[PDB]
Amino acid sequence: MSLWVDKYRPKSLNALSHNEELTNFLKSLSDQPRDLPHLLLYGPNGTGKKTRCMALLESIFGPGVYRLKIDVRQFVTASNRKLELNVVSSPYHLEITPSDMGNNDRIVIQELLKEVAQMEQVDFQDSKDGLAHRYKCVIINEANSLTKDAQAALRRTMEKYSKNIRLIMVCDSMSPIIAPIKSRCLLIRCPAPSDSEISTILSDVVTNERIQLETKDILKRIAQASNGNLRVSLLMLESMALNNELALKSSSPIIKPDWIIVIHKLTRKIVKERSVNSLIECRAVLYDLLAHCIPANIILKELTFSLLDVETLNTTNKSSIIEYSSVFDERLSLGNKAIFHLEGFIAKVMCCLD
Amino acid sequence: LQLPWVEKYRPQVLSDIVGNKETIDRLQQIAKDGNMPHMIISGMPGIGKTTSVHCLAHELLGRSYADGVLELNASDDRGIDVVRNQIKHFAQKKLHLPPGKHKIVILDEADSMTAGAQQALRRTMELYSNSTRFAFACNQSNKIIEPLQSRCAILRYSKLSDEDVLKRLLQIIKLEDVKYTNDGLEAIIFTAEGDMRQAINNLQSTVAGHGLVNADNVFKIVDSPHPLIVKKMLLASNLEDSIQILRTDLWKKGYSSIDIVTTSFRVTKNLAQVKESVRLEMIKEIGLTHMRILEGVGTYLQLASMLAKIHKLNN
Amino acid sequence: SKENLPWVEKYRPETLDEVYGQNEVITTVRKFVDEGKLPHLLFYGPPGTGKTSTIVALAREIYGKNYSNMVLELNASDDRGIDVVRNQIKDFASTRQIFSKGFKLIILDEADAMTNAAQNALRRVIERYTKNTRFCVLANYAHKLTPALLSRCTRFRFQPLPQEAIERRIANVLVHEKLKLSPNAEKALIELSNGDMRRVLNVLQSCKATLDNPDEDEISDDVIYECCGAPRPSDLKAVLKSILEDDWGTAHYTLNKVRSAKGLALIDLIEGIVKILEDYELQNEETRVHLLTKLADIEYSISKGGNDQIQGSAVIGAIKASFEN
Amino acid sequence: NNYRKFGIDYTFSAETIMNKEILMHPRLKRIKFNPINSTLLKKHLKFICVQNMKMLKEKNKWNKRQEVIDYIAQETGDIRSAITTLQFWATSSGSLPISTRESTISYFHAIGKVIHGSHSTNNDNEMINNLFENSNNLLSKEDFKLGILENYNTFNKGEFSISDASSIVDCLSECDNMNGLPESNEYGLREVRKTFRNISKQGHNHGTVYFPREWKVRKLQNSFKVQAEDWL
DNA sequence: CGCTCCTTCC
DNA sequence: GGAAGGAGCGTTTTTTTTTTTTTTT
Numbered sequence A: 001m002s003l004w005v006d007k008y009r010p011k012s013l014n015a016l017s018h019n020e021e022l023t024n025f026l027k028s029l030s031d032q033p034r035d036l037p038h039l040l041l042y043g044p045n046g047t048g049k050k051t052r053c054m055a056l057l058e059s060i061f062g063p064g065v066y067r068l069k070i071d072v073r074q075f076v077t078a079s080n081r082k083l084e085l086n087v088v089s090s091p092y093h094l095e096i097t098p099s100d101m102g103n104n105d106r107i108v109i110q111e112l113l114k115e116v117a118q119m120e121q122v123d124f125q126d127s128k129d130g131l132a133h134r135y136k137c138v139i140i141n142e143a144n145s146l147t148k149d150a151q152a153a154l155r156r157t158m159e160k161y162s163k164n165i166r167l168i169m170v171c172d173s174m175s176p177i178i179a180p181i182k183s184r185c186l187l188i189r190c191p192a193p194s195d196s197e198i199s200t201i202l203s204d205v206v207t208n209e210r211i212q213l214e215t216k217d218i219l220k221r222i223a224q225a226s227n228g229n230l231r232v233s234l235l236m237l238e239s240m241a242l243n244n245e246l247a248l249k250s251s252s253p254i255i256k257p258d259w260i261i262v263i264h265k266l267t268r269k270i271v272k273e274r275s276v277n278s279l280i281e282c283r284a285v286l287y288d289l290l291a292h293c294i295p296a297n298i299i300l301k302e303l304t305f306s307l308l309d310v311e312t313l314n315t316t317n318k319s320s321i322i323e324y325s326s327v328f329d330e331r332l333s334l335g336n337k338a339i340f341h342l343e344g345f346i347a348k349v350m351c352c353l354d
Numbered sequence B: 001l002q003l004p005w006v007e008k009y010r011p012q013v014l015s016d017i018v019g020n021k022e023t024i025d026r027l028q029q030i031a032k033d034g035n036m037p038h039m040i041i042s043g044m045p046g047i048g049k050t051t052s053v054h055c056l057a058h059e060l061l062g063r064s065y066a067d068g069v070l071e072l073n074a075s076d077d078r079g080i081d082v083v084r085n086q087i088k089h090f091a092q093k094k095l096h097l098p099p100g101k102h103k104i105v106i107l108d109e110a111d112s113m114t115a116g117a118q119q120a121l122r123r124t125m126e127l128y129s130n131s132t133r134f135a136f137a138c139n140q141s142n143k144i145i146e147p148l149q150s151r152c153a154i155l156r157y158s159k160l161s162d163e164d165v166l167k168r169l170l171q172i173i174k175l176e177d178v179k180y181t182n183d184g185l186e187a188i189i190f191t192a193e194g195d196m197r198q199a200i201n202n203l204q205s206t207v208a209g210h211g212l213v214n215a216d217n218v219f220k221i222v223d224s225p226h227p228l229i230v231k232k233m234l235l236a237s238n239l240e241d242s243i244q245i246l247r248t249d250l251w252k253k254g255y256s257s258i259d260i261v262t263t264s265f266r267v268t269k270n271l272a273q274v275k276e277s278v279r280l281e282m283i284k285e286i287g288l289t290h291m292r293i294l295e296g297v298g299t300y301l302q303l304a305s306m307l308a309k310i311h312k313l314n315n
Numbered sequence C: 001s002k003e004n005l006p007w008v009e010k011y012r013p014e015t016l017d018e019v020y021g022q023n024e025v026i027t028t029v030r031k032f033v034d035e036g037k038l039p040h041l042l043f044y045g046p047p048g049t050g051k052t053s054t055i056v057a058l059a060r061e062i063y064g065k066n067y068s069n070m071v072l073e074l075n076a077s078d079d080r081g082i083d084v085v086r087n088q089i090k091d092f093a094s095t096r097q098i099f100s101k102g103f104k105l106i107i108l109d110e111a112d113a114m115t116n117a118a119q120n121a122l123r124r125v126i127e128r129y130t131k132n133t134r135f136c137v138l139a140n141y142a143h144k145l146t147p148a149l150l151s152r153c154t155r156f157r158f159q160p161l162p163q164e165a166i167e168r169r170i171a172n173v174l175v176h177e178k179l180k181l182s183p184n185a186e187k188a189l190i191e192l193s194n195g196d197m198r199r200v201l202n203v204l205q206s207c208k209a210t211l212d213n214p215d216e217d218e219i220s221d222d223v224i225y226e227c228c229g230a231p232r233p234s235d236l237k238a239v240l241k242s243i244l245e246d247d248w249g250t251a252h253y254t255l256n257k258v259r260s261a262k263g264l265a266l267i268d269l270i271e272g273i274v275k276i277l278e279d280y281e282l283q284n285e286e287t288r289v290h291l292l293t294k295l296a297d298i299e300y301s302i303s304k305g306g307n308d309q310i311q312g313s314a315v316i317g318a319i320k321a322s323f324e325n
Numbered sequence D: 001n002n003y004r005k006f007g008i009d010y011t012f013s014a015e016t017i018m019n020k021e022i023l024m025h026p027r028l029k030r031i032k033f034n035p036i037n038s039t040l041l042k043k044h045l046k047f048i049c050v051q052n053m054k055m056l057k058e059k060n061k062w063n064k065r066q067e068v069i070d071y072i073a074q075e076t077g078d079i080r081s082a083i084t085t086l087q088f089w090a091t092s093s094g095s096l097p098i099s100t101r102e103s104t105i106s107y108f109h110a111i112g113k114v115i116h117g118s119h120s121t122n123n124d125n126e127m128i129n130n131l132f133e134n135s136n137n138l139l140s141k142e143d144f145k146l147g148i149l150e151n152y153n154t155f156n157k158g159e160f161s162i163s164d165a166s167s168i169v170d171c172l173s174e175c176d177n178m179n180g181l182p183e184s185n186e187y188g189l190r191e192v193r194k195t196f197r198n199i200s201k202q203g204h205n206h207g208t209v210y211f212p213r214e215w216k217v218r219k220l221q222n223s224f225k226v227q228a229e230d231w232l
Numbered sequence E: 001c002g003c004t005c006c007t008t009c010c
Numbered sequence F: 001g002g003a004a005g006g007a008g009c010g011t012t013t014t015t016t017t018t019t020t021t022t023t024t025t
């Protein structure tokens, strides 16, 4: 069947079970949705932002928002480069991820979204006389990944055509969002669930799946290992249950993403040996990680925080590590090729440790 | 109307060309001998490359210059089709010339020729070298593809010395009956920076402006070359001196910040006195300032900060 | 029709006598046309110094009032690729005059926007047809021009407008309009002009608009500052004094009050303070280095937006640390 | 007039003219030629001079033939260019600076020059200036910085201090943030050359130079994207 | 340009 | 039996706009 992440996905505002204040605020937003402003939900990845957006859409329109189909929209660049984008559509709303088009994301904003904003939605009234108009809802996934040009192109589209369109953007951090876009949106903070709420959800799933649990401490350990990511918590719960014949025990290992263990091994190697050859081996590991399309900034963050957890290191080493991490994160943001900056960070760490 | 002196006094014969004495003597030898090979002429602007090639062709072909010379430059169509048809037909033409004389194809500014046309020229040169010879003129000899360079004798022109510029300037003054002073000619030569076209243009401008070519009269219109000012600014031992030069001599005179930074990079590339580490650090600072200027912050404050960073590098 | 035009275009010089601040260049070109020996020209200079006006006036003087028939003008708003150079410019330069009116004129305004290929193609066009045609190039950035093109042209530098020329032009505008300007207002206008006549004319038009009764009201420096929203010299002096003498809290409060009084922008205050400090007598040279570097960094950061209060605190701290040396 | 950044517009070679299928076809044999070495070129120039002994002796240049031949053989591996230069020198009664056609250096040759330096030139600034003047196409391309980054460890087979490697990589990272300006490339190459010269010693054994592996990573990323789309 | 295995030359 | 000299190695390749050439029509 479907993965437990999607199997037990809440489908309504009243079905939510953590961050009750956010649920109440969302319900207040849906009281009079006629004048609903553009929304920008920001929060840690995997906390349930898309789920809450879908719940709000369901409250405004109904369960039909969850009936989703996929279409392919074709775009042509100036150089005639033909490419395609996936548009997820429901009878009441549309879903797009322009960042999938990289530097061409702006085209998606200039051609597709604008057109959607320009075409007023009207329909014959079933009972009353005359047409009826309803604004279209559009969701922009990974808003923080948009290039500055696409964000600039969004401005007048949001303003002029507010009657026909209402945007709901979702992001993990607002730092890459340009100030004009933040000015045009209602900002909604989405806190991560606490360990207790994650454990409660996992225990509910366990009860539903008839999985024998030795003690509830296993769920707490899984929640701790997930670092507040409920999706990861559910995925590891399913993996552990399947690998243990649906009978979890305190001795059952906790499965973590493979790249995370790889980064931990890289950190251990960096701490142990510091030399040019060690740096070349670390570069090989970094290139292997990048081959799997892991973002460079995520790699840098994971490596930095893995290094900071090493007990043998002292305060000065950790301070130098965080300094270098900040500098090279800025370099990555302003750079073109990530390998230079990751290798430079590792070299600086090796110099400071030795 | 009266032509400008640059075009009015363009030499007609090789004997009137000054500078690169060995090169001009070799060209005269070729002209009086006849067996001209494929040749490439490279050098900086305004030193006589076009004049030298045209004079050589004229002297070689005599009355047959009209029917024995095919001239093409960047202002004409010079694509692959032109090589396929016009140059090919000219090279195929059977022309009766004095013994040791050949048809000449002058390709001025040959560096700008497209890759396809240059590749096509290989077969033309291979097939029609018996009766046709090619004289390429360019500023960067490396911009001609190696297969073509392999068939040609290279000839690099050096920048003209002050002595030859003064000699030809005196000849022009004698022809024009221009009143002058020694300091004025020295100022003209200093401002010319080895480019004789600029020297003649500045001499004509000064003669018109006041009639008498004095240093003060020369500097009223012509300005000292800004690269030297930039070098003086960079080599100043005190930050205050560098800032004063930047303000008075460059900024207050209307020089744009982008021009200033580009000239600073070019000058720093050739600073022999400075050490390599200091030079590369200065290049880095200049590049950072250039990046800031390109983004739109072309302010005097940014140039002052660049100078301060360079002075820090010196210390 | 001229009344409806903006002052920047309404007061465009029509004759070479109306171009001020370029006495040497103007005299040279006037005498060149008098002797009919115009060479290929290059006019290099910063914005709003009179290059386009000067060249158009020279064309008018040469060809009277029918210059449009024998002058080919091209600028950045037109396409000027290599094909254009090969066909249009070449055909115009290689054709006879309309009525044998001496030589033809080709004006390439804003030639620094042309491509390298087009400039390279222009060399032999300029050289071959010098007898029948003369070229005029105008530029603000010389680094965009190829060395050959620079070598082919006689160079003339348009300096930033001197104060006296600006005063004479302002007097002409004031007599034209029914406007009165105070000496302090004129001094402030010249100071903020930075040698650009366009800025002077635009600010004067805005000041006239600001007057409730321009028929009798006189423009004061306060009117100029209001129209431009720029800081007064007193505000800059007070801010610098507070930064260099008072404590952090007092300096922060003073900066906030001075900015909130008239909604001043931080970049304007930074520029004014930099100008003031450029004349300061510093006994320690490292102070100048730190001031320049930190203030340039703050200006660059401001150019990209950011947090205004943090930037102001950064300016205060940078000045204090620099002067603590 | 080109302003195009395709493979063929940068280099005219078998790889850019042919494709992988043709080159790797079992029925196609490829043989690579090298520049003519000094021995053969000297022999052939000597033969040509001997054939023209009468005129050379008459013009008095015969006695100096060797002095130029060894120069020409030392300057180029192009037989046609060498013969043309010899003819030009001989036919000239005066004295001129003998010169042949310029020869571009290969990618690995440029990497070696940047890392270890040049035997002929002892001044690093002159070498860098000449390299940029005559090899701008190769140096400007973004793969040269990758090659430097992936091959700087070959020095002494990676037996130098981690500080020098850190300095080199930090400089490359800073250059990557300069929007591809010429100053960035100049700064990077100069930093690498100066760092390697500061530690140059007679008793050093160097490693093998290799091409950067970025293209493999790009291919793996494309395969991953296809698989991810299939899963989606 | 440096390392690595093959002749060539005296 | 030592040099010195030389060969083979060390490789692959789209993308933003803007401009330009080429080819077929």
Ligand SMILES: Nc1ncnc2c1ncn2[C@@H]1O[C@H](COP(=O)(O)OP(=O)(O)OP(O)(O)=S)[C@@H](O)[C@H]1O
Residues within 6 Å of the ligand: B005, B006, B007, B009, B010, B011, B016, B017, B018, B019, B043, B044, B045, B046, B047, B048, B049, B050, B051, B052, B138, B139, B160, B168, B196, B197, B200, C147, C148, C151
């Ligand atoms: N050596 C020289 N002797 C006398 N006059 C010279 C000399 N070099 C340049 N001139 C003058 O400058 C004019 C232009 O000379 P050219 O030979 O066309 O310049 P150039 O060397 O071809 O520069 P480029 O490459 O075309 S920009 C001539 O007509 C002369 O008036």
Ligand SMILES: Nc1ncnc2c1ncn2[C@@H]1O[C@H](COP(=O)(O)OP(=O)(O)OP(O)(O)=S)[C@@H](O)[C@H]1O
Residues within 6 Å of the ligand: C007, C008, C009, C011, C012, C013, C018, C019, C020, C021, C022, C045, C046, C047, C048, C049, C050, C051, C052, C053, C054, C139, C140, C169, C197, C198, C201
């Ligand atoms: N020397 C001057 N004398 C009088 N008015 C001037 C002068 N220079 C500029 N102006 C005024 O400013 C306006 C613009 O002058 P322009 O000559 O077009 O500027 P510019 O020198 O061409 O600067 P660029 O290069 O086009 S930005 C003119 O119409 C005049 O009103």
Ligand SMILES: Nc1ncnc2c1ncn2[C@@H]1O[C@H](COP(=O)(O)OP(=O)(O)O)[C@@H](O)[C@H]1O
Residues within 6 Å of the ligand: A004, A005, A006, A008, A009, A010, A015, A016, A017, A018, A044, A045, A046, A047, A048, A049, A050, A051, A052, A201, A230, A231
């Ligand atoms: N209140 C909740 N109760 C149960 N599961 C939840 C709740 N909120 C979120 N989840 C789970 O979290 C998972 C990921 O949430 P999602 O909205 O994709 O995170 P993101 O904010 O990164 O988009 C979903 O599969 C969903 O089942």
Ligand SMILES: [Mg+2]
Residues within 6 Å of the ligand: B049, B050, B051, B108, B137
């Ligand atoms: Mg020429």
Ligand SMILES: [Mg+2]
Residues within 6 Å of the ligand: C051, C052, C053, C109, C138
């Ligand atoms: Mg203008």
